Amino acid sequence: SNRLDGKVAIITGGTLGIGLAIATKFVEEGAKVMITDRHSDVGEKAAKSVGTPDQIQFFQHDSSDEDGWTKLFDATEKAFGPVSTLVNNAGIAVNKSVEETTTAEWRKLLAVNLDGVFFGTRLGIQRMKNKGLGASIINMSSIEGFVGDPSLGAYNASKGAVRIMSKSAALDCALKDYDVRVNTVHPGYIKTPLVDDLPGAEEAMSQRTKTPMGHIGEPNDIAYICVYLASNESKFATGSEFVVDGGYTAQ
Amino acid sequence: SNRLDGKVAIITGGTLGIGLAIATKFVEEGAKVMITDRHSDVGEKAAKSVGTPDQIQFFQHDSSDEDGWTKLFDATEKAFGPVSTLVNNAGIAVNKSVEETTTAEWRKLLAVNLDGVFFGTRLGIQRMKNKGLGASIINMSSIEGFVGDPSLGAYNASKGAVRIMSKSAALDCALKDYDVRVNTVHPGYIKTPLVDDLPGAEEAMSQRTKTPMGHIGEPNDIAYICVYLASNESKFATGSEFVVDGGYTAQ
Amino acid sequence: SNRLDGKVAIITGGTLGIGLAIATKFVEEGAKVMITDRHSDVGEKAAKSVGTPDQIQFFQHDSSDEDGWTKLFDATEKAFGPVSTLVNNAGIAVNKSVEETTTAEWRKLLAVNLDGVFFGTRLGIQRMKNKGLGASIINMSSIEGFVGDPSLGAYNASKGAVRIMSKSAALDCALKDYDVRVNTVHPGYIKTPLVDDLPGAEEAMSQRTKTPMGHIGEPNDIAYICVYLASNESKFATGSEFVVDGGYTAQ
Amino acid sequence: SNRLDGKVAIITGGTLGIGLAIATKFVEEGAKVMITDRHSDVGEKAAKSVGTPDQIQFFQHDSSDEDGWTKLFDATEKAFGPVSTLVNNAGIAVNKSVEETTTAEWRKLLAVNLDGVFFGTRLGIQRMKNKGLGASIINMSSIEGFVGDPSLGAYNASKGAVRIMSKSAALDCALKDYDVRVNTVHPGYIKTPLVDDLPGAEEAMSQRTKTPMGHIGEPNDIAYICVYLASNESKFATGSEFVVDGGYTAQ
Ligand SMILES: NC(=O)C1=CN([C@@H]2O[C@H](COP(=O)(O)OP(=O)(O)OC[C@H]3O[C@@H](n4cnc5c(N)ncnc54)[C@H](O)[C@@H]3O)[C@@H](O)[C@H]2O)C=CC1
Ligand SMILES: NC(=O)C1=CN([C@@H]2O[C@H](COP(=O)(O)OP(=O)(O)OC[C@H]3O[C@@H](n4cnc5c(N)ncnc54)[C@H](O)[C@@H]3O)[C@@H](O)[C@H]2O)C=CC1
Ligand SMILES: NC(=O)C1=CN([C@@H]2O[C@H](COP(=O)(O)OP(=O)(O)OC[C@H]3O[C@@H](n4cnc5c(N)ncnc54)[C@H](O)[C@@H]3O)[C@@H](O)[C@H]2O)C=CC1
Numbered sequence A, B, C, D: 001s002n003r004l005d006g007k008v009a010i011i012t013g014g015t016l017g018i019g020l021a022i023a024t025k026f027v028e029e030g031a032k033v034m035i036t037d038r039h040s041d042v043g044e045k046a047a048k049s050v051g052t053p054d055q056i057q058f059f060q061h062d063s064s065d066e067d068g069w070t071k072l073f074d075a076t077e078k079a080f081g082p083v084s085t086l087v088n089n090a091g092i093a094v095n096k097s098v099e100e101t102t103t104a105e106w107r108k109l110l111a112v113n114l115d116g117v118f119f120g121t122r123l124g125i126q127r128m129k130n131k132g133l134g135a136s137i138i139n140m141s142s143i144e145g146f147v148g149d150p151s152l153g154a155y156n157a158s159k160g161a162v163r164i165m166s167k168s169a170a171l172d173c174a175l176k177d178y179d180v181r182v183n184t185v186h187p188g189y190i191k192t193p194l195v196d197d198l199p200g201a202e203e204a205m206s207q208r209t210k211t212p213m214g215h216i217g218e219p220n221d222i223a224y225i226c227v228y229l230a231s232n233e234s235k236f237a238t239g240s241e242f243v244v245d246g247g248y249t250a251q
């Protein structure tokens, strides 16, 4: 209760899975939230399921769309006042090795997972710096930002990029006294309706050779670390990686 | 409020600095707490300053004392019921390079910082496993578990040891379904009364080449990450490292 | 002597600095080498300075040019026989924070440093797999793939991407028995004619707060780790990072 | 050939497995070598199998024996002149979880794997600093210094300790211009006569979920990275970790 009082958050890809749980817990903790998705059927349903428009709204946006990022911040500040918190959560995956990644697949995935995170982080710094907001940018950067997977080549590139680009941003903001922190969150495998629709994936993901806890996580597992990072509780944390993975990377 | 309802925690070195703030926030969040120190003058004063005996008590113990560790768990369970949470926070430092570390200094520091953490972790697993407690062992493992410092040789050894031993314990507990998580917390430099008594240390620590944020942290910065790790909010986090360092390790 | 007997190597950006030293030592150790640069004035001079055309040749190529990558492998195999070794060394830097990185700067740097390395790695796997060559892909991935720098935002993104994408490729090649290894090399600061032309850079780079050894490296420092990685001496090394940095990342 | 001309090396645990291969390649490259083992039957046989006494000798020593370390350096300098190179390779393992590690097991393993490496490193710095030798200390610090194993708790503690203590030593030596480098080598699983005597271990170790290359390494895989680190080829490498693991830690 009240851990995000006063905060105004944008969460990209906030209508389902991890993003939706982040939104839910943020609203529970007193934040105002703008969620996005590139679609609208999903997004408008999503917001009302969490709360009332004074708490949470939807804005249609593809995170790879540079110009839209500006539309999104403007819409958020007009609904709720100056943005304090950005969660760059939107992402896609391609199930290909590096060897077999088409150039089109490469470019598409980097547009969302890398360019989108760059656009959001760059704009977030510009919009949030020097306002006494206790501003926090939280970039979703995966267990696949620490370890490779033979069938996630482009995804691995994007997540490693986000991991280290976020440190650069953290340092500049710290050195310049901007009152903006930048950190990454690295989920292991999490169970969502989308995973449930992939036959065998959860089981495959729950083998002890993958996730030592022998099961995968839930969306709220990622929501709670994001609450910590958005809150002023984490005012000395910047430039670091927060892993919530059931032990995946510990072995 | 209520984030640690029902929890019963031991915090070693809990009478001052980071340990005391961990204790304070744990009690605020509903945990019962036993704090320790090798002394008693410090420890008894400390507990009453946080709360009443039904909330927090003191037990005299040197974490290097293997037999005492057993006394400590027994005293905690008799005061508050079965222990769910252990914070291995007690530690010492020697201001010596590897080159100049005496063997006596080496052994003394390893006894507290390494053996003590081993004794606590081993006993904690044995006492906490298989009770449905949502048990959590939180080992204090430093920025000096990631990077070296030329004048902290033995300290660096101990912190690197804790970092990886904790992963071993996390994995075994996960694989065996023990309902015990093990994680490490890695503070950067934190401002305490002890640091205040070391002329020039905070300033030295606040240079941008050391801490990018240009200042050092406060004890509550470490308390809040410990609340997250002790709580069931972090039920999917095991075997990982949580860094709160003002950017120190990001550059 | 003879440590790369029989090997056929492509080195991108091989006409100056680190690339030229890699080429020089590779030829000394018995490899045949094709060096590249996006220019030709630099490239043709470079090759003759190292050896005769039966040892080393130049091919004009911008590593961001996908179609050219195919031209480059074909020219190398026609000069020297099937390629066994690829060093993805070409790279550029932008001296900008994330905050101030223009989109054009972002795209240009990613085209060379990320897309170029992807194109080379993908093609290298396809061309080298399953030929008994003891094939090795060596991706230049920087100290800036481990730590951030506030004024190298895009560069940091690219180097973190290369670091982890390389692990993906390593794993797929290992799992599929391709006889291709993939590793990254992470130079600290190295002294070259280009650094010499940047007033104050070497000195700035030699401060103990940057490079503990108190001086920067030389091109051969990177050449020698590349010889090891190209040779069959390193037949069990894949998916890992080889840092040669004067202590930069150790503190 | 000649890559270690002039060097004088001590290799602890140099009579079998990885240590013996390190010794063999060191002698091949022109170094003079003193190997150790706590036994003598093994050690005297070992040296003659590699070369003549002017190339390689044996000295009986348990690396946990502090006073003996001094005897060992003196015997080496009297045979071969001032020591330039130290490989802290002796180590033992206990097949126990943290939970089940007896205190006696803990102390015994730390005495060899941690205290022994401390004693060697401390003495090596003192004996080697400031002599223009191009001195190099190479500490064997395992894949189990990066990841945990549920059944190697004490071993994991020791290897994490060595990993970070070595960075401390590297930094002090660099900052003080000692002409001593300190680095760690991290083998994955390697096939030796001892592994061959453990039924099922190699197979278990070769599963793709353990070692992606699908087989384990050979002793020379570790010897060759040690040659690089002992040689002046690696004069800019200090404070870093060199992993040769078949991909184990990349996934
Ligand atoms: N679910 C899992 O098991 C894992 C998820 N992750 C990461 O967690 C993050 C969030 O995951 P989920 O919310 O559960 O995703 P999800 O798998 O449940 O659904 C995909 C989500 O991505 C967003 N998205 C995709 N393309 C987009 C675009 N062009 N513009 C805006 N939004 C877009 C959508 O809003 C959608 O909610 C992602 O970045 C993903 O990379 C990482 C590891 C595992
Ligand atoms: N204060 C700082 O700047 C930093 C602290 N740390 C780590 O944080 C942890 C806690 O720090 P503080 O509480 O602020 O310590 P402190 O510096 O304020 O005071 C030392 C504390 O260590 C405990 N302690 C020492 N030897 C002990 C023994 N033999 N038995 C039981 N307890 C013992 C005492 O209770 C005392 O409260 C330590 O493990 C330390 O290594 C790490 C980096 C920086
Ligand atoms: N010199 C230094 O201090 C450091 C260098 N590095 C990295 O080391 C690698 C090699 O460095 P140097 O050879 O010394 O570079 P250099 O600084 O001496 O010169 C730049 C080199 O990059 C190559 N290059 C740039 N754009 C290219 C393109 N579009 N196509 C083909 N080639 C291109 C050129 O061949 C040129 O030789 C680079 O990837 C760089 O990122 C990393 C840290 C420090």
Ligand SMILES: NC(=O)C1=CN([C@@H]2O[C@H](COP(=O)(O)OP(=O)(O)OC[C@H]3O[C@@H](n4cnc5c(N)ncnc54)[C@H](O)[C@@H]3O)[C@@H](O)[C@H]2O)C=CC1
Residues within 6 Å of the ligand: D012, D013, D014, D015, D016, D017, D018, D019, D020, D036, D037, D038, D061, D062, D063, D064, D089, D090, D091, D092, D112, D140, D142, D143, D187, D188, D189, D190, D191, D192, D194, D195
């Ligand atoms: N063989 C393998 O699969 C792996 C080995 N390692 C590490 O590699 C290093 C070397 O391995 P190997 O030479 O193959 O060992 P080994 O397994 O072949 O034989 C044990 C070696 O340890 C030395 N040793 C043990 N206790 C000693 C003492 N008290 N004093 C002096 N020497 C002692 C002995 O000389 C003996 O040669 C060790 O530190 C080990 O921790 C790490 C991972 C895997």
Ligand SMILES: C[C@@H](O)c1ccccc1
Residues within 6 Å of the ligand: A093, A094, A095, A144, A152
């Ligand atoms: C790593 C996670 O994002 C994932 C990617 C592709 C398919 C399933 C899961």
Ligand SMILES: C[C@@H](O)c1ccccc1
Residues within 6 Å of the ligand: B093, B094, B095, B144, B152
């Ligand atoms: C790293 C921290 O624990 C410290 C150690 C010695 C002196 C000051 C601070």
Ligand SMILES: C[C@@H](O)c1ccccc1
Residues within 6 Å of the ligand: C093, C094, C095, C144, C152
């Ligand atoms: C990190 C190195 O590539 C560099 C980049 C920009 C300017 C100088 C040096």
Ligand SMILES: C[C@@H](O)c1ccccc1
Residues within 6 Å of the ligand: D093, D094, D095, D144, D152
């Ligand atoms: C990790 C390696 O040193 C090992 C330890 C115990 C048993 C087998 C192998």
Ligand SMILES: [Mg+2]
Residues within 6 Å of the ligand: A147, A248, A249, A250, A251, D147, D248, D249, D250, D251
């Ligand atoms: Mg792993």
Ligand SMILES: [Mg+2]
Residues within 6 Å of the ligand: B147, B248, B249, B250, B251, C147, C248, C249, C250, C251
């Ligand atoms: Mg650093």
